[PDB]
Design a protein around this ligand. Structure first.
Ligand SMILES: Cc1cc(/C=C/c2cc(C(=O)O)cc(N(C)C)c2)cc(C)c1O
Ligand SMILES: Cc1cc(/C=C/c2cc(C(=O)O)cc(N(C)C)c2)cc(C)c1O
Lengths: 116, 115, 115, 116
């Protein structure tokens, strides 16, 4: 599992469960190709997005569908999504955790990058 | 101006000065059309991006070129850029400030929407 | 004024208005002595806390009464208060802004230190 | 383990390892009594601070020694520590994770509270 996403809710003090996440990879022609997608579990985690074979070097975009999350809770939020765009694996394979902490009008995101 | 951008640096404890910021508006075919851009001032602010007449309801993306900012300071960054995507809604307050707080491997962003 | 406090609300997307803020200075016996206090304005800011003559090097604590803020808005909060503890250093820049971004179960804080 | 602390480094993109953490509990006389302490592991986590017997209702302060962390990395940071003050267990026992994300001039903190 070289790519994991973790999402927390700053209003509830809980994991953000059932959050849709879409990952894109920039293609040769500079468009964003779908790469993988999933949704967070009861613990706010999304495992199993990709494999070390498929997760090659590239520029990746992790789109966390925050609007749909808040709307399902009955809240009208500010942002459409939280986006995280980064070059991956450019000095060899790494493991990436992308974490996000959500509020209706704000979010924060961080990356934890480790070398297997 | 109905749209202001403020950028801060969490490593140096300072405004993020001379950061490129690009604003896009989502077009009918779901593509992102350039809308406004500029660089942040000595106070980390970018004023004058648009006018009330131009800034209609729609989906907007603010892209902050964080990678170039960090590189100009000699610091190794994670992200290509920081992106903030939101809907402008006339039912809410009329002035939008998009604030971002930057670190090499993280960022925070908030909206301050006032009348 | 060498010390300003700015408070924002991440739930409403607004300044955090009428929030009590208390500043303390660490005394020789390691106790916290009251130094300055006030409430944030309509812009979420608290100006005029101190003067250059009064604000000497030392360890300071800024306590933001977040629990009362959230309760006055009808929102259930986690923290008793948000605390920011730092050393004022004359070797660095001369104006300190302590900024805080509040959510019910989280907060962010940064320092903007400029000349 | 009803109280866990997790600390991340926003400069390195890593767990914050070897961070000292001190927990205090407000006593009857309004002073801060030492309650427990420890340091984060290689994963940025601190487990084993307390037990469900000892972790009674009260007002707790979790002090994360950020200054000492940054100084050990050769960096002069702004804050002395990151402090998190909260009432715990007032509607019965809960499990609390206090997470912090550190930069030299900034930090963010959140709580994840779950009911066993
Ligand atoms: C963006 C951000 C992430 C975090 C991440 C917290 C966290 C991260 C992990 C992880 O897998 O890296 C796990 C947990 N748990 C287990 C609560 C919590 C915390 C704060 C305060 C933040 O502002
Ligand atoms: C902790 C924190 C502070 C800020 C600060 C925003 C800010 C906004 C204004 C404003 O005029 O809207 C002013 C300032 N100042 C005065 C530093 C700061 C932003 C984010 C995303 C944060 O996580």
């Amino acid at each position: 599992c070289p790519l994991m996403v973790k999402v927390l809710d700053a209003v509830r003090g809980s994991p953000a469960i059932n959050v849709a996440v879409h990952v894109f990879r920039k293609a040769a022609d500079d468009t964003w190709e779908p790469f993988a997608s999933g949704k967070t579990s009861e613990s706010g985690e999304l495992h199993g997005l990709t494999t070390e074979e498929e997760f090659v070097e590239g520029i990746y975009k992790v789109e966390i569908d925050t609007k749909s999350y808040w709307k399902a809770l009955g809240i009208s939020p500010f942002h459409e999504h939280a986006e995280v765009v980064f070059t991956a694996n450019d000095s060899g394979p790494r493991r990436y955790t992308i974490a996000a902490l959500l509020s209706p009008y704000s979010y924060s995101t961080t990356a934890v990058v480790t070398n297997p």
